[PDB]
Amino acid sequence: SGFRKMAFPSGKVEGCMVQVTCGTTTLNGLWLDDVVYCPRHVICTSEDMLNPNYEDLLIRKSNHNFLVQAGNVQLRVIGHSMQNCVLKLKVDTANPKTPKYKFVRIQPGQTFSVLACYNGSPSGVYQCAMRPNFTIKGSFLNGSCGSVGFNIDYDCVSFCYMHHMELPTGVHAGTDLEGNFYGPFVDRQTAQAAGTDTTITVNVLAWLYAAVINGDRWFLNRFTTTLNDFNLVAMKYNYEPLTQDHVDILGPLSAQTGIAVLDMCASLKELLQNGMNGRTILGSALLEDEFTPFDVVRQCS
Amino acid sequence: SGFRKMAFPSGKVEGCMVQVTCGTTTLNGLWLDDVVYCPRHVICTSEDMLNPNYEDLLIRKSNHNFLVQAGNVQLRVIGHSMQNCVLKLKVDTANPKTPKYKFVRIQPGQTFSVLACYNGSPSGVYQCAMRPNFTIKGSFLNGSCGSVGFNIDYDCVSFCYMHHMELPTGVHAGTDLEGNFYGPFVDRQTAQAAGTDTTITVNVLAWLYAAVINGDRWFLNRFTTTLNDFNLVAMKYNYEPLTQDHVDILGPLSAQTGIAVLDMCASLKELLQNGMNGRTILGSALLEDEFTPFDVVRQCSGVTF
Ligand SMILES: O=C(Nc1cncc2ccccc12)[C@@H](O)c1ccc(Cl)c(Cl)c1
Ligand SMILES: O=C(Nc1cncc2ccccc12)[C@@H](O)c1ccc(Cl)c(Cl)c1
Ligand SMILES: [Cl-]
């Protein structure tokens, strides 16, 4: 029993964190096999922040300009290339702590664990969701660039995010491990704004099922709704549309608790209309949207 | 920017998790040097748990009765002893991944990270607080017994908790690594209830400072209070008393934000008597009490391990 925001154990990723220094900029790198991945903006100066030509700046760089440190050992960079917004630094040593891994690009609503690092040293691990506006609501200070988001599948680490920057609202933008940004963001100091954020409806419903599995039933009601009537109500509270894919995904939780998805959808409509009236669900006074249907099943059963 | 519930990186502890099997019971063990620590109830059966004489049950067990597995390698138990509610299994091999560590008993209100394990394999890490009623509001399923709570101080792991059981309300009870239970709990199948819980006042204040550091200032007011007037109000709302030690500990955050502790207490006093009025603090509609003053300083200043 109980329901917590749970991150994956971070050991497999800690053994990959290194410090990457280029001139005056120091950030984090991910050392997998003989390659160190890090944000390409590590090659930027003060004059290069507004409109950097990364291909031009990288061609001017030599391998000896990149200082890579794994613990108290300096690694030798024997090559450098760029893949989208990620810099790949070939090193002369394969990381002996390289876990079984994959690079996976995630969709909005998906959750992952963040290992926040500074100077190639892990300082904390927390759980995040890719917001519908493609930002992440992280906890990052200057120096955290290169910190990664990941999930663990049995023994395999799926790297899904690399931290690049903080937007003016304090939210975070980054890329997958192939250097492709999540969202309409660019690695330039040009004016960029996160789009209006919305609540991840499928995740709220998954969390309502987690609450029922844990014995919290006060919010349940005798009503059901059509999918279309639910979406018309949901949109008015800035909630993401719930698709037939989401209804299907909630099927196992629906079967386990005996509450149809459209039936839970009517509970959610009522909660949006009434609020919680001084009550809590799983110790929370707000509707939690950073637990996916997969997270709920994994944590509860 | 941002403020998250953050656990310590769990790698140093993951390299210590093993699976301990005794008869039909399988749970987790903590392998440090040549000793595997685990809850002593691993030696119990259904009848035994009802009223167990652990000294009697342990004397009947042999070293070969404890099956210890570290990954896919079986460790051989060369000795067994009991220290309070923890079983210590001497093994022939010292854990090569043993970090610098200490066993520390924590006080209520102190936070720690939990590495939840099943079958000696870590499955999740979360941050939580030792409630004033000595329970933890954890997230644990059957098979999680032996999962540990820890903090990291520089390069040293301080083990502070080992999971033993779940109380009827779904909250959790366990011991320090010396086998002493936190709270008035016993490791036996009997009627046990967690006492009425209270809010960890010093931690709420630390979290209000974290909200100010993040730009959330709507709850600040012009007023100040006394430690006595505030404690009278706090007691009324089932909040733990705030001591001069707590005021002193909140000093650095008071200095950084320019908000005196008794100034923040008057904000907390108004929040208690009036509510949030539809507003949130750090995206929460409730006052968060599972961040200590040290946690807030560590997170809002990026200390690494
Ligand atoms: O935002 C950044 N770092 C931070 C990350 N994460 C959190 C931070 C908090 C405060 C200060 C900085 C933070 C920059 O290093 C940065 C600025 C501009 C651009 Cl366009 C790029 Cl690609 C990167
Ligand atoms: O509570 C237990 N385990 C669990 C722990 N933590 C969470 C659990 C969730 C579901 C089921 C079981 C859980 C028991 O194994 C147990 C029963 C009685 C006693 Cl007196 C003792 Cl010492 C231990
Ligand atoms: Cl402090």
From Swiss-Prot, chain A:
The coiled-coil regions, if any, are none
Describe activation and inhibition of this protein.
Inhibited by pyridone-containing alpha-ketoamides compounds 13a and 13b. In turn, alpha-ketoamide 13b (tert-butyl (1-((S)-1-(((S)-4-(benzylamino)-3,4-dioxo-1-((S)-2-oxopyrrolidin-3-yl)butan-2-yl)amino)-3-cyclopropyl-1-oxopropan-2-yl)-2-oxo-1,2-dihydropyridin-3-yl)carbamate) inhibits SARS-CoV-2 replication in human lung cells. Inhibited ex vivo by michael acceptor inhibitor N3. Inhibited ex vivo by compound 11a and 11b.
Domain Peptidase C30 residue range list: 1-301
Q: For the cross-link Glycyl lysine isopeptide (Lys-Gly) (interchain with G-Cter in ubiquitin), what are the residue positions?
A: 5, 90
Q: Which residues lie on this side of the membrane: Cytoplasmic?
A: 1-301
List the active-site residues: 41, 145
Q: Where in the cell is it found?
A: Host cytoplasm; Host Golgi apparatus; Host nucleus
Q: Which reaction does it catalyse?
A: TSAVLQ-|-SGFRK-NH2 and SGVTFQ-|-GKFKK the two peptides corresponding to the two self-cleavage sites of the SARS 3C-like proteinase are the two most reactive peptide substrates. The enzyme exhibits a strong preference for substrates containing Gln at P1 position and Leu at P2 position
Assembly information from the UniProt record? 3CL-PRO exists as monomer and homodimer. Only the homodimer shows catalytic activity. Interacts with host FBXO22; this interaction promotes the proteasomal degradation of nsp5.
> Which purpose does this protein serve, as stated in its record?
Cleaves the C-terminus of replicase polyprotein at 11 sites. Recognizes substrates containing the core sequence [ILMVF]-Q-|-[SGACN]. Cleaves and inactivates human TRMT1, preventing tRNA guanine(26)-dimethylation of tRNAs. May cleave human NLRP1 in lung epithelial cells, thereby activating the NLRP1 inflammasome pathway. May cleave human GSDMD, triggering alternative GSDME-mediated epithelial cell death upon activation of the NLRP1 inflammasome, which may enhance the release interleukins 1B, 6, 16 and 18. Also able to bind an ADP-ribose-1''-phosphate (ADRP).
Q: Quote the protein name from its UniProt record.
A: 3C-like proteinase nsp5
Designated gene of the protein: rep
